[PDB]
Design a protein around this nucleic acid. Structure first.
Lengths: 90, 98, 110
DNA sequence: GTTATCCGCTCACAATGCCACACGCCTAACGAGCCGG
């Protein structure tokens, strides 16, 4: 479980970037199906999101870098699928 | 007295009040001042729109909870359209731009 | 000698089309209505005389009597029921009270 | 004279939130209905 919040507000900027960044991380962890970095302790996604914030492995720059990287890999992989279709046609 | 999902009124699509009629509590005006006084923004949006007066929003929310996905759909409250339709009952044009 | 049809002169306008296309081609295959789906009903009409239908037209008087009987019986029964169910109480008033109340339920909205 | 002010009279508009509980929300006379005398 988790009681305090003040280990994150001194890591991310204020008490308002923390809400949006941790909500975005928990939303892509819950439904998008990604595996968490630190191990769970049978907690919910909000608490494990705040834990990954306060240790310092999830940040807004880091979220946009990872999303850009995996999305570029996604469009590159479907371009590879299109070139595989082009190999299969001719 | 408690309530998860009960009945609704006729004119405005709000839930009823009271214990006997299986009602919800009046999250009144001063509590809205209190939530504005924090930095609470999304919680005010649920207490204003998803919990009441957005019909398609609240049924989408209920299905979305049972499916196990916590999203929300903002929408627009039906009571505001009521307000528009009884200002237009006077001689007052009032519309929405864009 | 009229030939005052629009489709006729329009076909004559496109006579080069039907001259070019119908080179070793048929002209038209258009089916009509067939007498299979037409009952002739011509077995006998000699006793079907006009003066005998004049003396004997068709009749549904028994239908009107039956319908009037149904209406009169239903009016008597409904008049008796609306006579002894909405009566007026006398000099003292309604001797009871309705007292009906409806509570609420917990109705989900899936 | 006439003009620019000062003052008294009259009138619209506000007065916390929530809860339960409980009982109330037309009719003397104008258009129809039944059938008796």
């Amino acid at each position: 479980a988790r009681v305090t919040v003040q280990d994150a507000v001194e890591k991310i900027g204020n008490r308002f970037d923390l809400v949006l960044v941790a909500a975005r991380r928990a939303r892509q962890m819950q439904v998008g199906g990604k595996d968490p970095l630190v191990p769970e302790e049978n907690d919910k996604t909000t608490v494990i999101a705040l834990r990954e914030i306060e240790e310092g492995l999830i940040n807004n720059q880091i979220l946009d870098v990872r999303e850009r990287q995996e999305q570029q890999e996604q469009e590159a992989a479907e371009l590879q699928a299109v070139t595989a279709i082009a190999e299969g046609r001719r | 007295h408690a309530r998860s999902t009960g009945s609704y009124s006729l004119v405005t699509q709000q839930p009823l009040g009271g214990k006997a009629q299986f009602g919800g509590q009046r999250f009144g005006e001063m509590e809205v001042w209190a939530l504005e006084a924090y930095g609470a923004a999304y919680t005010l949006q649920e207490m204003l729109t998803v919990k009441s007066d957005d019909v398609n929003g609240r049924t989408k929310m209920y299905k979305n909870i049972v499916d196990g996905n916590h999203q929300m759909e903002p929408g627009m409250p039906e009571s505001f359209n009521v307000l528009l339709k009884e200002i237009r009952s006077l001689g007052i044009n009032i519309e929405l731009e864009d | 000698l009229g030939s005052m049809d629009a489709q006729t002169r329009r076909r004559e306008r496109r006579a080069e089309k039907q001259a070019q296309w119908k080179a070793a081609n048929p002209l038209l295959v258009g089916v009509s209505a067939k007498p299979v789906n037409r009952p002739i009903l011509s077995l006998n009409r000699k006793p079907k005389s006009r003066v005998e239908s004049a003396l004997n037209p068709i009749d549904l008087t028994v239908l009107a009597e039956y319908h009037k009987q149904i209406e009169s019986n239903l009016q008597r029964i409904e008049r008796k029921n609306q006579r002894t169910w909405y009566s007026k109480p006398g000099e003292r008033g309604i001797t009871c009270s309705g007292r009906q109340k409806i509570k609420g339920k917990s109705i989900p909205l899936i």
